[PDB]
Amino acid sequence: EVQLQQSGPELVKPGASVKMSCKASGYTFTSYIIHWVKQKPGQGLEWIGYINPYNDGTKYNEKFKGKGTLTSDKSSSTAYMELSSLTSEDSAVYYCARSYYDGIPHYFDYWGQGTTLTVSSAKTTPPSVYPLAPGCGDTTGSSVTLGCLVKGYFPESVTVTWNSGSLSSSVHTFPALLQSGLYTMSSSVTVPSSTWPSQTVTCSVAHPASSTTVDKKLEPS
Amino acid sequence: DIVMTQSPSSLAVSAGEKVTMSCKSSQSLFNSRTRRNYLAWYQQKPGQSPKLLIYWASTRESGVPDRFTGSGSGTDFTLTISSVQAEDLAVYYCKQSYYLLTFGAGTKLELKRADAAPTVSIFPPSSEQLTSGGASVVCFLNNFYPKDINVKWKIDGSERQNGVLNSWTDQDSKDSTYSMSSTLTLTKDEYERHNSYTCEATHKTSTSPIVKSFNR
Amino acid sequence: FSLPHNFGKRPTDRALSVILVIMLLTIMLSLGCTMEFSKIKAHFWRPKGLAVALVAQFGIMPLTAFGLGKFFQLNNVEALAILICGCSPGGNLSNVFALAIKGDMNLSIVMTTCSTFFALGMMPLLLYLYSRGIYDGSLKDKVPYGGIMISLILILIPCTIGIILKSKRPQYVRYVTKGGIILLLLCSVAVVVLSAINVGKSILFVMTPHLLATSSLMPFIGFLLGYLLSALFCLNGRCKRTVSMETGCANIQLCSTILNVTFPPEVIGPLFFFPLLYMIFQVGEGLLLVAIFRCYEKF
């Protein structure tokens, strides 16, 4: 059956000049039109415009008229999108959808895998891990929670594990949100207080986009 | 132009109770020439591309479950499910294509719970990053089901709410409850003069907000 | 279902095109031999009937097409086809029918050439205005323009040479006219056999209720309303017939070309047979009216 292929994730400096490729080889390319949909993370879908590869007819939304630019290639059976104007807020997921077009586009009956585009100053930096330790006169309780925060890592490909912790049991991973250029995330795991001193607990942060696999064990005050 | 709004935007149904998503649109988006009633109901599971469910506001794509059904005309539309299950938790947008391709705000479906018992945890900035020129104090709340919850910072009896950062958990599959995290980041040379840094949390499960204080 | 054979190869449709071109050349030569320039200038002196007939046609035909599309629930492509084909200017078929009824011929040719010349500009105007909700694009650049001027040249030049020959050497007209006639016969049979080479499956295209009703009414509506409006404005009997019969007929070449250029062939599969059917209906009405008209003058 018909499937849509996307270029993949892309990072770009705020100097713009970015290109997106959507390939479709499951049917006759010119018989259907291709729409582009923009989705910011957590704010819903947003339409951009469509292109008819038969007559190369492009229709744009009013909001994206200045920035969007849609082209097609019959020989490669693909559709290209260019923006040429990017800001820090333009990081989003873009989908290419196929719709039938007799006189009016009917519906997006098939969608692409979606490509994520990020705009920032880049300059990726090794993250720094900072543990969390209670003990400022508190009585704690039956169960005590612990964690280690991550500072100053640019790329999203980061994981935090508790090899000496409770593993998948009672672990919460807070998704990161962009702030001050360099964004941060956190993890938390709760363990019984009686067995915590007996068994040491360590957190390991793996950053495949970089060359660091730093791990550390927190120390009570 | 045509703008569409979805009323509930949030529902919680456990096992069998039918859902009802309605977006009233703006104008009569029904074609007089042909009785097509241009409207499309889509589904968006997290971390996945949207999937089409209903086209022409009354018919379904082949292969979708028969529990989904959509009925409407003119400006009034309604999508319902006879029986909801685990993989029916997604986001629905009810796109229209009568005049221009516009999407709705979206409706999120969750799983209901009996009640909530949030637990507060406060952690002060570590010394080694104090030597690094900054400080960050973090308080996070665990195991609370309802989304409506607020946090406040009392510093020496003063209400600041400056430089706040909040992060939400994605409602792990183990149970419908989830956690929240809040961080305050401040430079050195003002951490020690204020001290206090009491945190308070207001949630619908308790009339009295629950407060945790810090010293030194 | 899909297009019969392969339309991409175009095996013999070049022959059909050239035969139709030469047939139009011969018809326009005969028509130019028929008419005189002084009465054409006299008609230009008082275009009142001509102007009112032309503006009435351009005002009623697209509106009738839109009404038929609304009533019969045609799809977007079919509604666009009806709108384009309905508002097309008068073709050579109306001139041949004018030969059949021999009524005020030069008025007919002046009306058709003026209709083509003004339609050159009114096609974007009528298509942009009457197609709100169908083909949201402006389609102001997809209207053929070289084709219209080519048709204008092909309809004026043979008429010009014929009217010059008749007004300077009136003794050699009938002779060559007779020759044209026999040539027509030969070309005629070629047409039909070539149509066989491209007959395809026209039955598959014919959706009986909507397509048949639209074809039945639209030329009939044009004929009847043109005749009524000509009668109301105190027009001559020959003028009445020629105006009604010019407004009823239309042209199908530009309609087919614009449909082909705007849409991919798979979407407009059956619609490729719509203009031909349209033709095969209007003639089927045209001669019929002639068969009535003779009776109207027999008693």
mmCIF file with all atom_site columns, C-alpha atoms in Angstrom, chain A residues 35 37 39 43-47 50 59-63 95 102 104-114 129-134 136 138 144-147 149 151 168 171-179 184 186 188-190 216, chain B residues 1 36 38 40 42 44 48-52 55-56 61 93 95 97-105 121-124 126 128-129 132 136 138 140-143 165-170 172 177-181 183 185 212 214-216:
data_model
loop_
_atom_site.group_PDB
_atom_site.id
_atom_site.type_symbol
_atom_site.label_atom_id
_atom_site.label_alt_id
_atom_site.label_comp_id
_atom_site.label_asym_id
_atom_site.label_entity_id
_atom_site.label_seq_id
_atom_site.pdbx_PDB_ins_code
_atom_site.Cartn_x
_atom_site.Cartn_y
_atom_site.Cartn_z
_atom_site.occupancy
_atom_site.B_iso_or_equiv
_atom_site.pdbx_formal_charge
_atom_site.auth_seq_id
_atom_site.auth_comp_id
_atom_site.auth_asym_id
_atom_site.auth_atom_id
_atom_site.pdbx_PDB_model_num
ATOM 1   C CA . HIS A 1 35  ? -0.418  19.197 1.807  1.00 0.00 ? 35  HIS A CA 1
ATOM 2   C CA . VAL A 1 37  ? 0.952   20.475 8.122  1.00 0.00 ? 37  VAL A CA 1
ATOM 3   C CA . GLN A 1 39  ? 2.617   21.057 14.566 1.00 0.00 ? 39  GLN A CA 1
ATOM 4   C CA . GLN A 1 43  ? -0.255  23.204 20.416 1.00 0.00 ? 43  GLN A CA 1
ATOM 5   C CA . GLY A 1 44  ? -2.074  21.099 17.810 1.00 0.00 ? 44  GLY A CA 1
ATOM 6   C CA . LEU A 1 45  ? -1.977  20.819 14.048 1.00 0.00 ? 45  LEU A CA 1
ATOM 7   C CA . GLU A 1 46  ? -1.683  23.803 11.716 1.00 0.00 ? 46  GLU A CA 1
ATOM 8   C CA . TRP A 1 47  ? -2.116  23.865 7.946  1.00 0.00 ? 47  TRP A CA 1
ATOM 9   C CA . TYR A 1 50  ? -0.780  22.275 -0.659 1.00 0.00 ? 50  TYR A CA 1
ATOM 10  C CA . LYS A 1 59  ? -1.878  27.282 -2.540 1.00 0.00 ? 59  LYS A CA 1
ATOM 11  C CA . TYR A 1 60  ? -0.618  28.807 0.706  1.00 0.00 ? 60  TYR A CA 1
ATOM 12  C CA . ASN A 1 61  ? -2.190  29.799 3.994  1.00 0.00 ? 61  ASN A CA 1
ATOM 13  C CA . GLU A 1 62  ? -2.254  33.491 4.872  1.00 0.00 ? 62  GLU A CA 1
ATOM 14  C CA . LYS A 1 63  ? 0.016   33.026 7.896  1.00 0.00 ? 63  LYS A CA 1
ATOM 15  C CA . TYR A 1 95  ? 3.971   16.281 8.060  1.00 0.00 ? 95  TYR A CA 1
ATOM 16  C CA . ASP A 1 102 ? -11.073 16.717 -8.025 1.00 0.00 ? 102 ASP A CA 1
ATOM 17  C CA . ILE A 1 104 ? -11.513 20.715 -3.756 1.00 0.00 ? 104 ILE A CA 1
ATOM 18  C CA . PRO A 1 105 ? -9.137  18.755 -1.475 1.00 0.00 ? 105 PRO A CA 1
ATOM 19  C CA . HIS A 1 106 ? -11.215 16.099 0.251  1.00 0.00 ? 106 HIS A CA 1
ATOM 20  C CA . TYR A 1 107 ? -9.221  14.813 3.235  1.00 0.00 ? 107 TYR A CA 1
ATOM 21  C CA . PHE A 1 108 ? -5.745  13.698 4.296  1.00 0.00 ? 108 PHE A CA 1
ATOM 22  C CA . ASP A 1 109 ? -6.191  9.951  3.854  1.00 0.00 ? 109 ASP A CA 1
ATOM 23  C CA . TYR A 1 110 ? -2.465  9.160  4.223  1.00 0.00 ? 110 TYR A CA 1
ATOM 24  C CA . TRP A 1 111 ? 0.276   10.906 6.194  1.00 0.00 ? 111 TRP A CA 1
ATOM 25  C CA . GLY A 1 112 ? 4.046   10.892 6.335  1.00 0.00 ? 112 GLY A CA 1
ATOM 26  C CA . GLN A 1 113 ? 6.224   9.853  9.244  1.00 0.00 ? 113 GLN A CA 1
ATOM 27  C CA . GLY A 1 114 ? 6.825   13.534 10.004 1.00 0.00 ? 114 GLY A CA 1
ATOM 28  C CA . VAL A 1 129 ? 24.984  16.048 36.374 1.00 0.00 ? 129 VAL A CA 1
ATOM 29  C CA . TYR A 1 130 ? 24.004  17.425 39.782 1.00 0.00 ? 130 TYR A CA 1
ATOM 30  C CA . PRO A 1 131 ? 22.668  15.036 42.454 1.00 0.00 ? 131 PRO A CA 1
ATOM 31  C CA . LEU A 1 132 ? 19.805  15.609 44.883 1.00 0.00 ? 132 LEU A CA 1
ATOM 32  C CA . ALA A 1 133 ? 20.308  14.871 48.568 1.00 0.00 ? 133 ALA A CA 1
ATOM 33  C CA . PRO A 1 134 ? 17.951  15.494 51.513 1.00 0.00 ? 134 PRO A CA 1
ATOM 34  C CA . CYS A 1 136 ? 18.448  19.130 56.344 1.00 0.00 ? 136 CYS A CA 1
ATOM 35  C CA . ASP A 1 138 ? 13.886  16.383 57.998 1.00 0.00 ? 138 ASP A CA 1
ATOM 36  C CA . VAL A 1 144 ? 12.713  8.512  50.380 1.00 0.00 ? 144 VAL A CA 1
ATOM 37  C CA . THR A 1 145 ? 12.964  9.870  46.842 1.00 0.00 ? 145 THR A CA 1
ATOM 38  C CA . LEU A 1 146 ? 16.158  10.795 45.006 1.00 0.00 ? 146 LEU A CA 1
ATOM 39  C CA . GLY A 1 147 ? 17.288  12.107 41.649 1.00 0.00 ? 147 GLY A CA 1
ATOM 40  C CA . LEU A 1 149 ? 19.352  16.867 37.450 1.00 0.00 ? 149 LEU A CA 1
ATOM 41  C CA . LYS A 1 151 ? 22.463  20.912 33.101 1.00 0.00 ? 151 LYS A CA 1
ATOM 42  C CA . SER A 1 168 ? 11.572  0.665  35.902 1.00 0.00 ? 168 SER A CA 1
ATOM 43  C CA . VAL A 1 171 ? 10.700  6.026  38.242 1.00 0.00 ? 171 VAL A CA 1
ATOM 44  C CA . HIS A 1 172 ? 9.492   9.333  36.784 1.00 0.00 ? 172 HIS A CA 1
ATOM 45  C CA . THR A 1 173 ? 11.270  11.078 33.899 1.00 0.00 ? 173 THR A CA 1
ATOM 46  C CA . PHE A 1 174 ? 10.291  14.716 33.410 1.00 0.00 ? 174 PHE A CA 1
ATOM 47  C CA . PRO A 1 175 ? 10.415  15.734 29.725 1.00 0.00 ? 175 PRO A CA 1
ATOM 48  C CA . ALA A 1 176 ? 12.669  18.694 29.017 1.00 0.00 ? 176 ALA A CA 1
ATOM 49  C CA . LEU A 1 177 ? 11.441  22.144 27.998 1.00 0.00 ? 177 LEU A CA 1
ATOM 50  C CA . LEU A 1 178 ? 13.504  24.724 26.135 1.00 0.00 ? 178 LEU A CA 1
ATOM 51  C CA . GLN A 1 179 ? 14.771  27.660 28.191 1.00 0.00 ? 179 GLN A CA 1
ATOM 52  C CA . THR A 1 184 ? 17.239  20.577 31.024 1.00 0.00 ? 184 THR A CA 1
ATOM 53  C CA . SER A 1 186 ? 15.168  15.499 35.508 1.00 0.00 ? 186 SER A CA 1
ATOM 54  C CA . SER A 1 188 ? 13.195  10.835 40.209 1.00 0.00 ? 188 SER A CA 1
ATOM 55  C CA . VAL A 1 189 ? 13.054  7.428  41.902 1.00 0.00 ? 189 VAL A CA 1
ATOM 56  C CA . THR A 1 190 ? 11.716  6.526  45.350 1.00 0.00 ? 190 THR A CA 1
ATOM 57  C CA . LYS A 1 216 ? 27.554  9.462  39.906 1.00 0.00 ? 216 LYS A CA 1
ATOM 58  C CA . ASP B 2 1   ? -12.054 32.552 7.082  1.00 0.00 ? 1   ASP B CA 1
ATOM 59  C CA . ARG B 2 36  ? -21.151 15.766 1.108  1.00 0.00 ? 36  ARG B CA 1
ATOM 60  C CA . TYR B 2 38  ? -17.124 18.484 4.054  1.00 0.00 ? 38  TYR B CA 1
ATOM 61  C CA . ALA B 2 40  ? -12.946 15.070 8.619  1.00 0.00 ? 40  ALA B CA 1
ATOM 62  C CA . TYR B 2 42  ? -8.753  12.567 12.750 1.00 0.00 ? 42  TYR B CA 1
ATOM 63  C CA . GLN B 2 44  ? -3.509  11.611 16.982 1.00 0.00 ? 44  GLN B CA 1
ATOM 64  C CA . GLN B 2 48  ? 2.765   9.185  16.021 1.00 0.00 ? 48  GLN B CA 1
ATOM 65  C CA . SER B 2 49  ? 1.456   10.676 12.804 1.00 0.00 ? 49  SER B CA 1
ATOM 66  C CA . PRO B 2 50  ? -2.264  11.546 12.754 1.00 0.00 ? 50  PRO B CA 1
ATOM 67  C CA . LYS B 2 51  ? -4.612  8.857  11.454 1.00 0.00 ? 51  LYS B CA 1
ATOM 68  C CA . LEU B 2 52  ? -7.851  9.566  9.605  1.00 0.00 ? 52  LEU B CA 1
ATOM 69  C CA . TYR B 2 55  ? -14.641 11.548 6.270  1.00 0.00 ? 55  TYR B CA 1
ATOM 70  C CA . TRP B 2 56  ? -17.757 13.461 5.166  1.00 0.00 ? 56  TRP B CA 1
ATOM 71  C CA . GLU B 2 61  ? -12.318 4.642  6.520  1.00 0.00 ? 61  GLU B CA 1
ATOM 72  C CA . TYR B 2 93  ? -9.219  17.679 15.706 1.00 0.00 ? 93  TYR B CA 1
ATOM 73  C CA . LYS B 2 95  ? -10.610 19.246 10.355 1.00 0.00 ? 95  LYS B CA 1
ATOM 74  C CA . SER B 2 97  ? -12.138 21.532 4.020  1.00 0.00 ? 97  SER B CA 1
ATOM 75  C CA . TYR B 2 98  ? -15.243 23.357 2.768  1.00 0.00 ? 98  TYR B CA 1
ATOM 76  C CA . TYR B 2 99  ? -13.451 26.667 2.134  1.00 0.00 ? 99  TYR B CA 1
ATOM 77  C CA . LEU B 2 100 ? -9.941  26.448 3.608  1.00 0.00 ? 100 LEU B CA 1
ATOM 78  C CA . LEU B 2 101 ? -8.034  23.688 5.388  1.00 0.00 ? 101 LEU B CA 1
ATOM 79  C CA . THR B 2 102 ? -8.382  24.586 9.074  1.00 0.00 ? 102 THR B CA 1
ATOM 80  C CA . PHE B 2 103 ? -7.874  22.359 12.110 1.00 0.00 ? 103 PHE B CA 1
ATOM 81  C CA . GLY B 2 104 ? -9.572  22.499 15.485 1.00 0.00 ? 104 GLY B CA 1
ATOM 82  C CA . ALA B 2 105 ? -7.954  23.028 18.859 1.00 0.00 ? 105 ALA B CA 1
ATOM 83  C CA . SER B 2 121 ? 9.588   16.456 47.607 1.00 0.00 ? 121 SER B CA 1
ATOM 84  C CA . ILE B 2 122 ? 11.929  19.429 48.028 1.00 0.00 ? 122 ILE B CA 1
ATOM 85  C CA . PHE B 2 123 ? 15.627  19.348 47.206 1.00 0.00 ? 123 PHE B CA 1
ATOM 86  C CA . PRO B 2 124 ? 18.105  22.194 47.693 1.00 0.00 ? 124 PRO B CA 1
ATOM 87  C CA . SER B 2 126 ? 24.089  21.128 45.537 1.00 0.00 ? 126 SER B CA 1
ATOM 88  C CA . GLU B 2 128 ? 29.464  21.722 43.691 1.00 0.00 ? 128 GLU B CA 1
ATOM 89  C CA . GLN B 2 129 ? 27.251  23.755 41.358 1.00 0.00 ? 129 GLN B CA 1
ATOM 90  C CA . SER B 2 132 ? 30.004  26.743 39.588 1.00 0.00 ? 132 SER B CA 1
ATOM 91  C CA . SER B 2 136 ? 18.797  25.595 41.523 1.00 0.00 ? 136 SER B CA 1
ATOM 92  C CA . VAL B 2 138 ? 13.723  21.800 42.854 1.00 0.00 ? 138 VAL B CA 1
ATOM 93  C CA . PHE B 2 140 ? 8.325   17.949 42.571 1.00 0.00 ? 140 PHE B CA 1
ATOM 94  C CA . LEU B 2 141 ? 4.945   16.380 43.280 1.00 0.00 ? 141 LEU B CA 1
ATOM 95  C CA . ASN B 2 142 ? 4.210   12.703 42.673 1.00 0.00 ? 142 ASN B CA 1
ATOM 96  C CA . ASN B 2 143 ? 1.077   10.585 42.224 1.00 0.00 ? 143 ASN B CA 1
ATOM 97  C CA . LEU B 2 165 ? 10.085  26.326 35.474 1.00 0.00 ? 165 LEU B CA 1
ATOM 98  C CA . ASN B 2 166 ? 7.394   23.635 35.339 1.00 0.00 ? 166 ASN B CA 1
ATOM 99  C CA . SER B 2 167 ? 7.449   20.195 33.721 1.00 0.00 ? 167 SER B CA 1
ATOM 100 C CA . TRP B 2 168 ? 4.604   17.700 33.303 1.00 0.00 ? 168 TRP B CA 1
ATOM 101 C CA . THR B 2 169 ? 4.668   13.904 33.259 1.00 0.00 ? 169 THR B CA 1
ATOM 102 C CA . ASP B 2 170 ? 3.091   12.111 30.296 1.00 0.00 ? 170 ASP B CA 1
ATOM 103 C CA . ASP B 2 172 ? 2.695   6.639  32.337 1.00 0.00 ? 172 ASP B CA 1
ATOM 104 C CA . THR B 2 177 ? -1.662  9.217  37.897 1.00 0.00 ? 177 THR B CA 1
ATOM 105 C CA . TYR B 2 178 ? 1.431   11.265 37.105 1.00 0.00 ? 178 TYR B CA 1
ATOM 106 C CA . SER B 2 179 ? 3.906   13.778 38.494 1.00 0.00 ? 179 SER B CA 1
ATOM 107 C CA . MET B 2 180 ? 4.972   17.401 38.092 1.00 0.00 ? 180 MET B CA 1
ATOM 108 C CA . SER B 2 181 ? 8.280   19.183 38.663 1.00 0.00 ? 181 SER B CA 1
ATOM 109 C CA . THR B 2 183 ? 12.596  24.446 39.489 1.00 0.00 ? 183 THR B CA 1
ATOM 110 C CA . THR B 2 185 ? 17.288  28.942 39.230 1.00 0.00 ? 185 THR B CA 1
ATOM 111 C CA . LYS B 2 212 ? 6.678   22.219 52.936 1.00 0.00 ? 212 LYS B CA 1
ATOM 112 C CA . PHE B 2 214 ? 13.026  24.714 54.125 1.00 0.00 ? 214 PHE B CA 1
ATOM 113 C CA . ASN B 2 215 ? 15.761  26.149 56.337 1.00 0.00 ? 215 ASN B CA 1
ATOM 114 C CA . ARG B 2 216 ? 19.458  26.931 55.868 1.00 0.00 ? 216 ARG B CA 1
#
